[PDB]
Symmetry: D2
Amino acid sequence: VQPTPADHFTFGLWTVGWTGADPFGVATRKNLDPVEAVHKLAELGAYGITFHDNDLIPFDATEAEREKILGDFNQALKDTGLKVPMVTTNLFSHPVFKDGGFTSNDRSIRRFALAKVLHNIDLAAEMGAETFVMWGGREGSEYDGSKDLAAALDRMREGVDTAAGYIKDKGYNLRIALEPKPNEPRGDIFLPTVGHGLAFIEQLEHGDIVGLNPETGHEQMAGLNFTHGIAQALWAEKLFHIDLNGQRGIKYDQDLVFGHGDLTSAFFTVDLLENGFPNGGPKYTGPRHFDYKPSRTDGYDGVWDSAKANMSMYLLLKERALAFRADPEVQEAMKTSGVFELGETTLNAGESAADLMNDSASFAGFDAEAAAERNFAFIRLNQLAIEHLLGSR
Amino acid sequence: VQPTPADHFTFGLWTVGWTGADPFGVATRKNLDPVEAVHKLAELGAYGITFHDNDLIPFDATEAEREKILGDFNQALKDTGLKVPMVTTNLFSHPVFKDGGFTSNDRSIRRFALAKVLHNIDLAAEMGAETFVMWGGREGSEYDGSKDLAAALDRMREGVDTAAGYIKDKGYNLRIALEPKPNEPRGDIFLPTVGHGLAFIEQLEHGDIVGLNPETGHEQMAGLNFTHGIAQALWAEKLFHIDLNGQRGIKYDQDLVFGHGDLTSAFFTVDLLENGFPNGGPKYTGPRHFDYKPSRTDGYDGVWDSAKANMSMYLLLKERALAFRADPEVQEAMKTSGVFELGETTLNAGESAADLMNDSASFAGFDAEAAAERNFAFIRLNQLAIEHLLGSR
Amino acid sequence: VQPTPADHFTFGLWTVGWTGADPFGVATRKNLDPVEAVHKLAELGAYGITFHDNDLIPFDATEAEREKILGDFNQALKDTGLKVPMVTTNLFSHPVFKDGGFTSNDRSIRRFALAKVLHNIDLAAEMGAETFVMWGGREGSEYDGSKDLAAALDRMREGVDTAAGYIKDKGYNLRIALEPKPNEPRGDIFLPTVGHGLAFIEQLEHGDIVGLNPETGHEQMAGLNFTHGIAQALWAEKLFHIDLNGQRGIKYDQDLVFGHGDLTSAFFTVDLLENGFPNGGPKYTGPRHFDYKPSRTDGYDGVWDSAKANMSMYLLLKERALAFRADPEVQEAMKTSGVFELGETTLNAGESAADLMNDSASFAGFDAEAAAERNFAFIRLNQLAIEHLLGSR
Amino acid sequence: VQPTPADHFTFGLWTVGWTGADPFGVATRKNLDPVEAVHKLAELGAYGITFHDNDLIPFDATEAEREKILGDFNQALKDTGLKVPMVTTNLFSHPVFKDGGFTSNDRSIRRFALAKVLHNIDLAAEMGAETFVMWGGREGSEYDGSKDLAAALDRMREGVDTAAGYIKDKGYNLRIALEPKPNEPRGDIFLPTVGHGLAFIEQLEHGDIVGLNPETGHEQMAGLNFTHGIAQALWAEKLFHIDLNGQRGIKYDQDLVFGHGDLTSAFFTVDLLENGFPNGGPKYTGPRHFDYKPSRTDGYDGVWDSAKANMSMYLLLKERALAFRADPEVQEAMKTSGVFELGETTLNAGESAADLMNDSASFAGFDAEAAAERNFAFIRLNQLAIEHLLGSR
Ligand SMILES: OC[C@H]1NC[C@H](O)[C@@H](O)[C@@H]1O
Ligand SMILES: OC[C@H]1NC[C@H](O)[C@@H](O)[C@@H]1O
Ligand SMILES: OC[C@H]1NC[C@H](O)[C@@H](O)[C@@H]1O
Ligand SMILES: OC[C@H]1NC[C@H](O)[C@@H](O)[C@@H]1O
Ligand SMILES: [Mg+2]
Ligand SMILES: [Mg+2]
Ligand SMILES: [Mg+2]
Ligand SMILES: [Mg+2]
Ligand SMILES: [Mg+2]
Ligand SMILES: [Mg+2]
Ligand SMILES: [Mg+2]
Ligand SMILES: [Mg+2]
């Protein structure tokens, strides 16, 4: 199980560079030089790297420092071949953003947040990124009277449509990906799930270049089925990027390695990315990005190991999910369970609503108790899946 | 605190009629005659009643039984004046629906489910209902390989667009309201939240007459903020109906009386329905429906008491939320916290993206550390709210 | 991966016999005869069968009816060789137990719930059961004011200590195992987790013969780590029986097959039951009882598939857990991470608190910054367990 | 609703002093001097202040530095009259405690964590503290294989029993209180709830002087009923201290002010701490300690508002809880529901298990169907508590 650029494993600079400070303690690891991260990631088989403007350029950086940091960084990229598929903005660590960027109650802040974002789009554009990620981490509240919620969504729309309008105006080849999160750091975050993300998109003047960046753990924090969520994003064709990691339950964002959380769920996420839908449909073709944090208990050896464990986990799952769908016994079980059957339209070609209600056989004379006798055999189909996952069959 | 028809309290027939069987035990209460429910609800101050086709008409009812039951039922309505604002379909108790109605894997079932629904629309139409509710309770799975998820959403769309197409064709004055639920009775339900509900709607040929029926408890089962969810439904203008009840955490659907769960949340839901958005916007004007279950521990006295407790709770909360927004000290705190400020557009009239990025003051010379000094005072605004709720001020 | 009676797999009659009635629908399968249940399980390789009094003898049965039922049932056990390792009482289905058995606010229901238990200890002794399980499924409340919380525990203590003393008096060779559950059917059940169960036993007069019956799904309904919980029970020498199944999140009790829930957790569960502790310590040698429900979407073929599946899952993870611990690479990784080191006392033999305080090398002159550099290499250690689980190593 | 020193409200230095650094951002407020903290709290009506060794004395401080700090601090206590009821140790912030203090896989960190505690018991005695709190915040794991679960408990037992014996040896008049937490910062903390805490104490050599320090937010992070948990601690005579705050759901530790979380639960919490049990029994007379964090969106005015708010919330709910129990309508409702009846033993004086079994009126000739008709009227009883809470009665 050896990854290759062709695999499109991307990693966030803030991921391997996470030095370990959490809400109850300080960093356990020294800062990571961006040039080193670039080079280690290229020796591991990474395809690209992503970052937040302030991951690379300090908030207070002078112009001379900015040009230098970027010289060093492009030099590393040049030298190693890594791509920069996604760039994002940090609208959350500086105290100024304590109430959000786009949806801060303070107009002056909303303004700086949008400016900071427009500048970052130029940068994203220079770096050759295809995706522009928005994570509205400080957008929300701890109390229900803190905000006029209709005004918070108007404000969100203004910021996103302004960013998108500008992409169109500058002719950049960028798509905006919204990344939902239910809570943390705010008690309640706006656009908390994939569903809320897709909904909002549809209210946008420029929603056509706006899509989603679901994160495994974020969905699991609301106890939702991450495979079901991304399938909704796919079906609507708004799956522009994905963030893979592991979560063990409803609690703080753990950001474990992909597959170190809910494993069967990881299995079916891989089946979906790789194999697609059993009856066919859109397939995801973007970068497979890992947004995790090397546990603070581990030193730097652990850090490259966890980077490596991401890609292995994906590759192992990939192998199992291909075996799985390729097993003849699994294809038969599927057919039995009606998986292919769900793909057949309900109505007959040119059958109307009226046509159906008066069809006796479909209703009036339909024998409901006999139909109810079908053994769907979903347990056995489940068992086969598990046996493929365990490398048992 | 005495309700009046003018209040628009509606109750589901299955609510006061819930006889008490849960997954670990049998009914503790005798069946409720629909005629009695109609009359008790009218003596309590209810404005209307709602039902599922099989709440009133048995699955196996003969035609002669159907006409009788409806004679008795319309007689009660006639006599007491109650309205029938909403009607819904039972696509979940018969074994035939063990895998869903609309999204069952078995084509014959999908067909019967849609027929059963089309017939129910005629009925909804005869009863004078304005809203047609769809609760896809058996739509989902316990295992991730049971379903082709893109095919499950195509199937869902077919069923909903077919129902809606038919409303348009028959000229009925009905709107379809989708009711999301994250889980129970299935391990995972499709369209699990308000967000997923709104998203899907936008993929519909006839989404224009399709909206949402959020339920307090359903949203709280995924740990989401029910006030924030309905505010998104409002903002998108898709809040067609609401179901009020109480939930004490992430667990099975408790369906407690409204306000017997998360009370502050109940408080802010009422503030929102009644008072609207602090900066203005759409307001909800539909029935205030209670979909709860009188605890199985209580006999029939408890049953009318719990019906009555719904309406009292709403009225008490209403009183507190009007006092609250009317307090001058609260309006001042709000202004301080920037609630009205969030309502001011970010950009200046005819200011472009480009105009903003080069405005020095908004970015380049913006003093971020000084702005960050603002005391938002959301804690105090929270305290005032609570003190109004407790009838302290 | 062919089970055999020394595997000690047992199944409850209520599991395979569950006909599918959930709170939103009717049973989807025909009742199962118990004689057929014994024959069918013996043949699958089960070692024993468990039951609740009313699983076998109807609540309403007459004495002769009771005697006719046990005669066919006893014959069947003889014909098959199945044992009856554990017996339990139904103190939750009948309407009378609507507020509980032992903790019911009505004193005459309490006396009745306790006489139902006593009579059942006599049948238990008669069957050869070693463990008598108590699940206080209706013991709790939906509202905080419904109970005097100190009295409920006194009433609970009273019922369990009366049953225990009864055991000692008759000289039955039986132990009582309490089964914790945090909610469902009550909004709050008393003794909601393993901890609460363990603590409570320490306040009993006859605690010596009272221990616990943890269940996978149950602790997972409070988002707890099942392996950490059963570990504490064992450490305390209170793990008298165990119920194994699958739960996919904090939601209603799912009762999926063991391994169809949280897969990595099931693996570590099998590692502690089969292999025990790395530094040596207690071991559980009781039955591996499966407390699950065969999915209602499936017919009888899925019922026996499901029973097979529980035994398979356990046997697969069992080989992987043995390969895993046997692996010398794993043994070195555990060695690096300090798994063995934790087994070493903190204090040296005969060292006193004062000695340690007063030891400059342990505090005063301790290099804490140096010590912080240790790479615990927990991530790699995790990656090795997962590769072993995926049958990759 | 003006607090006074006999209200026994205490506050931790770390609470008001929290400057706002969360995992996604930097502190938003300037550090608070402890001298200023004492002066400011004494003035608000607090009775006492608590702290963690490193809250006052820096980890790095020199002896003279330690002495200079305690001198100003001790002066301040004198000038104000504030007491120091509880003291605790920081075994979580510094990088060395990355795998725990007492349960760290590294033996030399364990010895260091235990000497840090011993030295702190000496400062505790010196301050006049009666309670020494232990929060094992880093004691646990992110992966199941990281620890030998039996050894971790042995190491935990060892550290707590060494500290206890130390206490007894020196004759300090102090008790140890353990504070359970289910997760954060670890994916799984050991002794995750009140139950686990209580059970564990029973296995100690010096358990007699060891009890618990439950915290609202903490049990709520496992979705438990805080009133049912503190009730069990009290029943066991193990409720030695308490931390009060607010949590709005299963998510990260929010530390909102008491009452800004689950309002109905706070009310019943105040009813058990203030009024005790309806049939009489134990009472808690220790301090009402507030373990919260002032929201980072707010400046120092919100810090002191927030401190005021904790004391107000408690005092408001306190009057409502007294009015509520005093109400003769409530006393009759409780009487109907059986609250008092539960206080009655099940068995008659001198009745034996055999007597009861053998009593035809308690089992054989018991009308269970009749008994099932009782209207426990739990809903109405709930509605009365809520009207009292809304200051409506
Ligand atoms: O802003 C993008 C990036 N920021 C950091 C967030 O925590 C992560 O979830 C997100 O992918
Ligand atoms: O189908 C509509 C109705 N059905 C019963 C559901 O449980 C409830 O949530 C829903 O409002
Ligand atoms: O009473 C024992 C048995 N009853 C059925 C329960 O639902 C299960 O949790 C328990 O193991
Ligand atoms: O150590 C005591 C104190 N530390 C800070 C913790 O976060 C809180 O839960 C605990 O009460
Ligand atoms: Mg994350
Ligand atoms: Mg992310
Ligand atoms: Mg509901
Ligand atoms: Mg509903
Ligand atoms: Mg269960
Ligand atoms: Mg069980
Ligand atoms: Mg806390
Ligand atoms: Mg605390």
